[PDB]
Each structure stands twice: as C-alpha cells, then as structure tokens.
C-alpha cells in the first residue's frame, strides 16, 4: 500500500496564523489523486481539496493545497475560530485508498478561567440506589484542569470520569464535566460534596461545595 | 441539494451480519466511483472498498476481503455493504464517500455506527441537573440533565424541542465500569429566566427507541 504520514500529529495556533498541515507519501502519488479532508468531532468528513490542489464547493479560499510527488501540504493562510478540526489526507490513486493519520488542529486564545457549578444527586435517581454529583467547568481555556473531589473533606480516587466539549467555534474555549459516583448509601452517610478546581486562568483554586439537602 | 443518506448499521452480535445501504441525490450517482470508509472510537478514517461506476472492478482492505462485499443499484442511486463474521475489530462509524474528483464537500454520508457486541439494548434515566439556590451566586444559571445508563451509542439531546441552542453543552458520552453509557445535558441561562422560563430536555435514544422530556424545575430558598 502507500502510506501516508502527517505531520504535526498536533498543531495549535491562533486566529490570523498561517497553519501548515503536511502529508508524506510512502511512494510518488500524482497530483491528480491526493485529498484533504476536514473533521469535526462526530461529524461527517468534509472534502476540502481534491486532485491536490482544487477546492471543493463550498471551501473558502483560505484553504489551499499544494505539492506533488511525496510531499504535500494543506494551508490555511489566516486561521479562524471555526477551523479547528481534525485534517486527513487520502491518495486515491491505487487500492487501498489509504488516509493518513490526521492533523489535530487547535485554535489557541488567551487565557479564560473556568466557571464553576455544582449539581446535587436527583431525588429521582437516589430512588434507584446510586448517586451521581456533577461539577461542571464551564468555558475555560486552555483544556488542562484539575478537578478534585472531597466528601466531608476526605479526597476521592477513582469514582469520577470527565468529558471535554470541543472547542466553541466562536471563542474557543471548553467546558468539562465532573461526575462522582457513590451509592446512595454513601452519598446519605456525608454532608459536604466539594469539587475543587485548579487551572491556569484561576489566581488560586476555587472549590464549589454543597451541603446535603440545602436549599 | 446533494445527500447521501445512511441506514442498516446500529447494533449487531458478534459473528454476525449487517447490510448497510447509502441513498444518493443531487449529483450524478452512477459516474463515480465509490467508497467506504471505516473509524473505530476515537480513531481516524480507515478506508474499506471502493466500487467501479459499473459495479465491474472493486477493492477491499485485507482485514475484510472474502467477508464484506461492496456493491450497487445505479438505478436506485445507492450504494451498500454487504458485512459477515462481525468482530469487535469491525466496531465503527461506517461512511459512504464518493470519489472525490466529484468536487463536493458535502460527498459523504452521515455515518452509521455499527456496535459488534452481545448486549441489548437499553434506554437512558434521564436525571435533572439543578443547582441549589444557595450555591447559584449571580446572573447566570446552569441547568441541565444527565441521560445514565443506556447501550449502545447514540443519544441525541435537544432544549427546548430545538429552541434552546445558545449555552448548550452536551458532553461526549463516558462508558462506565459496568457497560453502559452516561452523558451530561447543560445550559447556562439567565438567572432572571429561571422564574418565567421553563427547560426541558428531550432525549432521544433511538436504538432502543425511548424518548424521554424531563422538566428541569430551578431551586430556591
Ligand atoms: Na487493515
């Protein structure tokens, strides 16, 4: 097969950057077969360049692509908020069609620290025998944060997952959810549920807390 | 407009089959050469075969030769694959990709994800999210609902039936230790709005076909 071998495997610039996404081909690749491609998460690819160097319909003309032989490239000559997304290059010349492994880029901002929000169990859900307590950070940058949980002052391990949303195609920040989960049992033998969170935008950690049945 | 609309996927025990179809419109279906291409979880696109306009020639990557089989109905516009012995290797979103000298960025289908698992169906909880009045300190709200312990993917979540699009924040989907997953709903709002606005979740898990509205009521003191 031919291989195809994308670099940066991570790119991460800022509005108005010229980003550069390349794409290496294992063995000479005409220029009438190579494609990029743009993914955003859990969405369809979109086809952006075509026969190396052709815009698809549709694709603003600060995407171009380039090269020939066993080096190609795709440019963005002046990023916007809304391109962040994983890019693909495919030669489709010979079986198999391979794409290489993706450029992820993502669109760096000034600092934004998060805001922070604390949701008790659901009478609902304790009928049921567990309890999930959710802490949310809400539109921060950039996506290293550190969420720790404390029930009646005591450190919790491995009783939480998080998620992160993408990158709002607006003003680039994320959001991260926070979920502990204990048994009901647990959760009406303790009186204080505290997520505590570090991050670069905060000047000192901040934790959000509730106590049990409070208003 | 041109779409390529997907079905056939979903959930599937493994050794067994799945027959995926792609309906084609707005382009000249039967002068291109077609595709499928393949991406596991967090994974990248993996092409899997690819079809002459005539249906006379066709490639398949080695994992899926002799099992999966590529095929089409010009008259119809649509393309299929035919897809046996599943494994949890074979677990993906599965696209329909035209070639691209057609020159259209809108030249895939939506995706269908194909599960290879053993385990049924199951619908969501869908639980409100509700902060106290006393730990909600200025202006803006957050609310929202946590849809636990449904199988497989997808859920779709909407406010509002679609009205409520600004602040929303639907978090990836966790697998959980005991096979089921859990996602979070959440909105930020006007605190003003929480008295005269109501908020409600609609989930929509279709595999299992369960639909649930959930009320978010506000806290207060
Ligand atoms: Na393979």
């Known amino acids: 097969e031919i291989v195809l071998t994308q670099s940066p495997g991570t790119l991460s610039l800022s509005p108005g950057d010229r980003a550069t996404h390349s794409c290496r081909a294992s063995?000479?690749?005409?220029?009438?077969?190579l494609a990029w491609y743009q993914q955003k998460p859990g969405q369809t690819p979109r086809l952006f360049i075509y026969?190396?160097?052709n815009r698809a319909t549709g694709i603003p003309d600060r995407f171009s692509g380039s090269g020939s032989g066993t080096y190609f490239t795709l440019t963005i000559s002046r990023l916007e908020p809304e391109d962040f997304a994983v890019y693909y290059c495919?030669?489709?010349?010979?079986?198999?069609?391979?794409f290489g492994q993706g450029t992820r880029l993502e669109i760096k901002r000034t600092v934004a620290a998060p805001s922070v929000f604390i949701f008790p169990p659901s009478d609902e859900q304790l009928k049921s025998g567990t309890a999930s307590v959710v802490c949310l950070l809400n539109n921060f940058y950039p996506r290293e944060a550190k969420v720790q949980w404390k029930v009646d002052n005591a450190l919790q391990s491995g009783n939480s997952q998080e998620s992160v949303t993408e990158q709002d195609s607006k003003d680039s920040t994320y959001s991260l959810s926070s979920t502990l989960t204990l048994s009901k049992a647990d959760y009406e033998k303790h009186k204080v549920y505290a997520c505590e969170v570090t991050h670069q935008g905060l000047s000192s950690p901040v934790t959000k807390s509730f106590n049990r049945g409070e208003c | 407009e041109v779409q390529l609309v997907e079905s056939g996927g979903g959930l599937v025990q493994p050794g067994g089959s799945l027959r995926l179809s792609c309906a084609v419109s707005?382009?000249?279906?039967?002068?291109?050469?077609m595709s499928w291409v393949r991406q596991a979880p967090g994974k990248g696109l993996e092409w899997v075969a690819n079809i002459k306009e005539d249906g006379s020639e066709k490639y398949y990557v080695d994992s899926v030769k002799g099992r999966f089989t590529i095929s089409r109905d010009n008259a119809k516009n649509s393309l299929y694959l035919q897809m046996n012995s599943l494994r949890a290797e074979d677990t993906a979103v599965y696209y329909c990709a035209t070639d691209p000298d057609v020159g259209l960025s809108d030249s895939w289908g939506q995706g269908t994800l194909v599960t290879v698992s053993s385990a049924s169906t199951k619908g969501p909880s869908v639980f409100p999210l509700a902060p106290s009045s006393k730990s909600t300190s200025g202006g803006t709200a957050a609310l929202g609902c946590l849809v636990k312990d449904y199988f497989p993917e997808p859920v779709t979540v909407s406010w509002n039936s679609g009205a409520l699009t600004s602040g929303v924040h639907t978090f990836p989907a966790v697998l959980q230790s005991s096979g089921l997953y859990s996602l979070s709903s959440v909105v930020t709002v006007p605190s003003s709005s929480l008295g005269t606005q109501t908020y409600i979740c609609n989930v929509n898990h279709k595999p299992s076909n369960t639909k649930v509205d959930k009320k978010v009521e506000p806290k207060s003191c």
């Open positions: 026969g190396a160097s």
């Open positions: 063995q000479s690749v005409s220029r009438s077969y």
């Open positions: 495919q030669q489709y010349d010979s079986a198999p069609d391979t």
């Open positions: 707005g382009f000249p279906f039967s002068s291109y050469w």
